[PDB]
Amino acid sequence: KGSVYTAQSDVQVPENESIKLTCTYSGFSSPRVEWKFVQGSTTALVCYNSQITAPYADRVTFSSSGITFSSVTRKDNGEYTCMVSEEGGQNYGEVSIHLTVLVPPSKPTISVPSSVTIGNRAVLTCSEHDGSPPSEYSWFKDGISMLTTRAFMNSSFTIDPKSGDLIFDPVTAFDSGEYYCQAQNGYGTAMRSEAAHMDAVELNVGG
Ligand SMILES: [Mg+2]
Question: Which family does the record assign?
Answer without folding.
Answer: Belongs to the immunoglobulin superfamily.
